[PDB]
Amino acid sequence: PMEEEEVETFAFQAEIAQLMSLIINTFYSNKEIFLRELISNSSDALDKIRYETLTDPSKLDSGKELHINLIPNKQDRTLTIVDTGIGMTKADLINNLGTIAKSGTKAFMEALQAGADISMIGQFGVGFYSAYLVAEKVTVITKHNDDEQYAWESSAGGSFTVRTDTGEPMGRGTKVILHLKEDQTEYLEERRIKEIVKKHSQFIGYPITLFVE
Numbered sequence: 001p002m003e004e005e006e007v008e009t010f011a012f013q014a015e016i017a018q019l020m021s022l023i024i025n026t027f028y029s030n031k032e033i034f035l036r037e038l039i040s041n042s043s044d045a046l047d048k049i050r051y052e053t054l055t056d057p058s059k060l061d062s063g064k065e066l067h068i069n070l071i072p073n074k075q076d077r078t079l080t081i082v083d084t085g086i087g088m089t090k091a092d093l094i095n096n097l098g099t100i101a102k103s104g105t106k107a108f109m110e111a112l113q114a115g116a117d118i119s120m121i122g123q124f125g126v127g128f129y130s131a132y133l134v135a136e137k138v139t140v141i142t143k144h145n146d147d148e149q150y151a152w153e154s155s156a157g158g159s160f161t162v163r164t165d166t167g168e169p170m171g172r173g174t175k176v177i178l179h180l181k182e183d184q185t186e187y188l189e190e191r192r193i194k195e196i197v198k199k200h201s202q203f204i205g206y207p208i209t210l211f212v213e
């Protein structure tokens with residue numbers, strides 16, 4: 001019996017939009033670093049719920065396990081990075097994932113225009129956007145203890161949407177789904193994923209698991 005769902009479309013802040021276009025339209029040779037950025041983000045999120053629980057144990061009612069799961073899907077061509085971290089509220093998503101200017105955006109673009117390696121992205125605080133080196137579309141599903149589950153999404157192009165997620169409920173955390181570009185499918189390969197995690201994400205302070213098939 002026909003479901004009615006609310007959607008809200010937002011405009012990326014000007015420089016974030018320019019950064020996304022720079023990332024998508026320019027050739028870079030070390031694109032694999034996108035995973036290190038996403039895993040670092042998940043690690044950051046896990047630290048936050050970890051410390052918050054020390055002060056309030058009920059914060060783990062939504063789930064005690066603190067870990068990261070990597071899920072490649074060769075059928076629909078998606079690579080999903082999941083964490084049981086702190087998660088983000090609707091306000092968190094809208095504010096921190098597009099709408100508000102970030103201080104390192106310009107500096108990073110300057111660096112890139114000068115020939116800096118993309119690997120540098122994390123030092124500028126805009127590392128999430130490196131997802132667009134390999135994905136044509138990114139969906140961020142998230143659940144924070146203080147809000148309902150939400151889905152953010154963008155195929156770049158200057159806008160992003162936010163809507164309540166009606167997919168599989170998550171206890172708490174964030175799930176980044178990368179809809180990979182046709183020539184970036186190597187990241188759906190178990191050997192390649194293991195290779196890059198070993199190379200760049202060896203000191204993650206939480207267990208990571210790769211689910212194959």
Ligand SMILES: COC1=C2C[C@@H](C)C[C@H](OC)[C@H](O)[C@@H](C)/C=C(\C)[C@H](OC(N)=O)[C@@H](OC)/C=C\C=C(/C)C(=O)NC(=CC1=O)C2=O
Nearest residue numbers: 041042044045083087088092096125126127128129140174
């Ligand atoms: C201070 O921390 C970081 C910030 C500032 C700000 C966004 C923090 C955020 O505020 C709501 C939460 O406190 C934090 C726990 C959530 C994450 C890191 C999310 O990752 C997962 N898995 O939760 C990430 O994924 C969509 C969201 C935004 C990341 C952006 C825009 C980025 O490019 N760089 C950043 C890396 C950071 O470490 C960044 O901006």
